[PDB]
Design a protein around this nucleic acid. Structure first.
Lengths: 84, 164, 195, 88, 131, 136
RNA sequence: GGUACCUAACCAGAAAGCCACGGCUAACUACGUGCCAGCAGCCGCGGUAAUACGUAGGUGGCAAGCGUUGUCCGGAAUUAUUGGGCGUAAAGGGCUCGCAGGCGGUUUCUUAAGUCUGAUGUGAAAGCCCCCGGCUCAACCGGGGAGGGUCAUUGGAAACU
RNA sequence: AUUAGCUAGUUGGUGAGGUAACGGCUCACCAAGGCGACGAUGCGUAGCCGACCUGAGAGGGUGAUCGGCCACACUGGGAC
């Protein structure tokens, strides 16, 4: 009787200046519907950091929920890997 | 090899070009000719036709036609596979199809394929619209055809293994 | 039309006679006895198409779609289109012999009433399948068009079972193109309407 | 509001009908959820074809049809099988 | 630089056909060694040989001229260029020269031919065309 | 050319004009602008009817209308028939027809319009030039 | 709506046209005409023998329609991924150093983002299409089925990226 | 791209109010972020979709009728 699993990703962090929140870049990449070659985009979101344990260039997962503020529609799961 | 003249050639013409030459006095109008020549059983050829008249050019087309013939494989009244000939700026590709599909080809090219006996060809004149080179676009591709039992003999392999 | 002036353009007795070529094989007109010229493929494939469509008088709005209705048919598309215009009900009336011309067979469908497995059919262009019976009710039981053409006892085609007074018409598996068209060259009309 | 009902189809003179589970708020040709089979008025004989089982699941959820639709179910005993389930 | 390994081995087979050399050298990576056994096992090579050296290895090919003057290999063509990855599915396995020619298909269950990818019904990359 | 060259420039596709520019635009009054109607045929008003010559080897003087449409644009049109009917301030319907010989005019006047009566004594070419069937 | 329909009675009686006719393109002659009147989508036709103008005859085209008109697609491989170019035909930046983006030698382990594949859920119906059946056939309408998703979840495959 | 810079309730946090409901949705406070060469902002343009037409297919054009949904009800704003 488990409820439906939500949207989820992992990615990479640009900046940390937002209060208890960050941006995370998702790098999934696809082909074009006319030619065939597979180029990469930039997909970035706004993610909740309840512990403020974020780094510039941090590998981390995000998890959506009800929208916490303006454009913020994610929370973290696990800080996967850190920067240097 | 050279195809012998011990056949039944049908030899209907394609076009006539009046072709000039400029001398001290004025022009000199002659005629040009080219006639696709063959049976309806797989032997196609042609020659040029040059004269100072209409009908003697029709005669001398048949000479180099009987000097130069070439043979086409007739697997199921089709071409056995797909090929694209590329002789001299006139590209004409050749596609096989099923047996009901008829002869869909260009103007001079349609007077070639019926002079093979092969009645199932899709084609499309990619290159220029010139009558000599479009016929050169056909036979050069038809020269590069292959037979099913022949390439299995080339590979040293079974013929049915080329199908299954 | 005249239905005979158009066949001398084709230069053939399209119903199959000894007439309409004697004394005048040149096609129509004052440019008739002035000797004709040799045409192109477009010159041929018109007349090669028109040697079949002037058999049945089919307007080319109705001639195009039956070619397309042969497109969905299996088998060779040339011989498929031979089947549909010899399964034409106008041709079935003429091949049962009660019409001297196929144009005479048109009134034999239109108001010379006739019964296909039931009430009546006023359709000169009904596609006829094997397994159908054809008769005429007593309202036009024996008129002199039928009475003379019963007496004109022509040969019955071998895909038909026909009696004179019983007047019933049924079929075989198909009308076969070897039996159907001696004059008309096939496989040219297909390459006409592929372009 | 949820009325299992007919749905008008066909040519101008001779109509055709499809028996349709839908909301009444959508129009006469409006959208729906899932249909059951057919109806033919223009045949002087029969050929009113019903799925005969799928609507009973909807009737256990509750969807009141009009009587002109309902008496076709009486002719095939959907409602009486359903009334046995209501007596069950 | 070299930009891809498989391109410069296929045309090197093709550029020997117009001169009719007997033998070749190809610097023999792993997938290079397995293409050569495909052409060997299916009628395009007299014999193929492996050479174990210290530098990177070399594979060598004895070209198959069985008849008078008739090249068995009449041309090659690499498709899946580095920047265009033709992934033909197992439903739409591209057979070439319809009845005659082969195309080598690298599948997840081995680098296969047309036929061994056909009956096993698994597609993927399409690495070359062979006349 | 190469593939990544194609992706971030695209195929810059070929843009072609019409066969006639002054049929492709209509007018509305209280909007005070110049709408894109693409109507086939318009009714117009002639202002100056003089005549002039064609350009080259053909040299036989033409009829040379100048018509003002309901878009607001004054485009010189052409009078096809064997002699004319039109005078100033008439009702002129215009179909799109290219005149190679005359410089600049790309518009026939439909002989057979609301005001243009058909040309005198014409049997062949009945649908064109606006003549009824003479007597049956 | 006594409408469809069916029954019987009546008469060749009610009823065909426009377009083309040098080459493209199937079909041509005779008069008129003399850079004028006029045709023209294309090449281009007429300063006295116009098969190209206009008329007549006669053909041919298609048909209750035919032409012209404006549109959009096609032929146009003439924006070319499938399906072009670049010595002189339209086209190599004057040449470099290079951030971003683009692409990767060889061997091996591993991973599964791409890829391959199953299963499940779904992409309503009408329409295209497969096949039947219904309307005098057709068109139309009906029955059943397929197809359509760079889809999502889930479970597999490991050569290549 | 012959539009390269654009936004201060903008973008963040905290609390408060408010909404059926999450929220700068509103307001106070505090912070300075956010959006951008994968083309923001701007401007001209236009209802979208199953589908229609065309092409051999890849594609291109159109988005009328019938079916889905949004928006609008002389123009504009509020509210029961």
């Amino acid at each position: 009787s488990e409820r439906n699993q939500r949207k989820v990703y992992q990615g990479r962090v640009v900046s940390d200046k937002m209060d208890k929140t960050i941006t995370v870049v998702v790098e999934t990449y696809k082909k074009h519907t006319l030619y065939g070659k597979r180029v990469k985009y930039s997909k970035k979101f706004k993610a909740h950091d309840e512990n403020n344990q974020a780094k510039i260039g941090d590998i981390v997962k995000i998890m959506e929920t009800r929208p916490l503020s303006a454009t913020k529609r994610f929370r973290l799961v696990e800080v996967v890997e850190e920067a240097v | 090899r050279i195809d012998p003249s011990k056949l039944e050639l049908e030899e209907r013409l394609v076009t006539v070009n009046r072709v000039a030459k400029v001398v001290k006095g004025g022009r000199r109008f002659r005629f040009a000719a080219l006639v696709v020549v063959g049976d309806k059983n797989g032997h196609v050829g042609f020659g040029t036709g040059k004269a100072q008249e209409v009908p003697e050019a029709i005669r001398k087309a048949v000479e180099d036609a009987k000097k130069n013939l070439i043979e086409v494989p007739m697997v199921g009244t089709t071409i056995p596979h797909e090929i694209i000939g590329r002789f001299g700026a006139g590209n004409i590709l050749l596609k096989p199809a099923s047996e009901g599909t008829g002869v869909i080809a260009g103007g001079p090219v349609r007077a070639v394929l019926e002079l093979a006996g092969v009645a199932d060809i899709l084609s499309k004149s990619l290159g220029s619209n010139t009558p000599i080179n479009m016929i050169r676009a056909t036979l050069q591709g038809l020269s590069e055809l292959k037979r099913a039992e022949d390439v299995a003999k080339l590979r040293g392999k079974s013929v049915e293994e080329l199908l299954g | 039309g005249p239905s005979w002036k158009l066949s001398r353009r084709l230069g053939i007795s399209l119903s199959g006679t000894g007439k309409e070529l004697e004394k005048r094989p040149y096609a129509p007109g004052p440019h008739g006895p002035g000797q004709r010229k040799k045409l192109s493929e477009y010159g041929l494939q018109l007349q090669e198409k028109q040697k079949l469509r002037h058999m049945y008088g089919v307007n080319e709005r109705q001639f195009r779609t039956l070619f397309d209705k042969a497109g969905k048919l299996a088998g060779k598309h040339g011989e498929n289109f031979m089947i549909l215009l010899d399964s034409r009900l106008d041709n079935v009336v003429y091949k049962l012999g009660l019409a001297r011309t196929r144009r005479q067979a048109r009134q034999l469908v239109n108001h010379g009433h006739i019964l296909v497995d039931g009430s009546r059919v006023d359709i000169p262009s009904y596609l006829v399948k094997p397994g159908q019976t054809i008769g005429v009710r007593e309202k036009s039981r024996n008129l002199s068009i039928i009475k003379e053409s019963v007496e004109v006892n022509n040969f019955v085609p071998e895909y038909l079972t026909f009696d004179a007074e019983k007047l019933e018409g049924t079929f075989t598996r198909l009308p076969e193109r070897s039996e159907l068209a001696p004059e008309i060259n096939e496989a040219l009309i297909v390459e006409f309407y592929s372009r | 509001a949820v009325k299992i009902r007919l749905k008008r189809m066909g040519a101008k003179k001779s109509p055709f009908y499809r028996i349709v589970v839908a909301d009444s708020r959508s129009p006469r040709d409006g959208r729906f959820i899932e249909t059951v089979g057919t109806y033919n008025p223009v045949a002087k004989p029969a050929e009113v074809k019903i799925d005969e089982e799928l609507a009973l699941k909807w009737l256990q959820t509750g969807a009141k049809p009009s009587d002109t639709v309902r008496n076709l179910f009486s002719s095939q005993g959907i409602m009486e099988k359903f009334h046995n389930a209501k007596q069950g | 630089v070299m930009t891809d390994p498989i391109a410069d081995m296929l045309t090197r087979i093709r550029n020997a056909n117009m001169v009719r050399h007997e033998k070749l050298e190809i610097p023999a990576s792993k997938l290079k060694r397995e293409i050569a056994e495909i052409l060997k096992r299916e009628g395009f090579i007299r014999d193929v040989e492996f050479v174990e050296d210290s530098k990177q290895g070399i594979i060598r090919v004895f070209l198959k001229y069985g008849q008078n003057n008739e090249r068995v290999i009449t041309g090659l063509k690499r498709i899946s260029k580095p920047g265009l990855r033709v992934y033909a599915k197992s439903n739409e396995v591209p057979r070439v020269l319809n009845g005659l020619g082969i195309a080598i298909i690298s599948t997840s269950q081995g680098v296969l031919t047309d036929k061994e990818a056909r009956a096993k019904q698994a597609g993927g990359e399409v690495l070359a065309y062979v006349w | 050319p190469t593939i990544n060259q194609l992706i971030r420039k695209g195929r810059v596709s070929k843009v072609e004009n019409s066969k006639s520019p002054a049929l492709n635009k209509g007018y509305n009054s209280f909007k005070k602008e110049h709408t894109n109607v693409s109507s086939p045929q318009k009714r117009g008003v002639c202002t100056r009817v003089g005549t002039m010559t064609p350009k080259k080897p053909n040299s036989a003087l033409r009829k040379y209308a100048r018509v003002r449409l309901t878009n607001g644009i004054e485009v010189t049109a052409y009078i096809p028939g064997i002699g004319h009917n039109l005078q100033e301030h008439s009702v002129v319907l215009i179909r799109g027809g290219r005149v190679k010989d005359l410089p600049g005019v790309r518009y026939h006047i439909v002989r057979g319009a609301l005001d243009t009566a058909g040309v005198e004594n014409r049997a062949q070419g009945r649908s064109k030039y606006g003549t009824k069937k003479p007597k049956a």
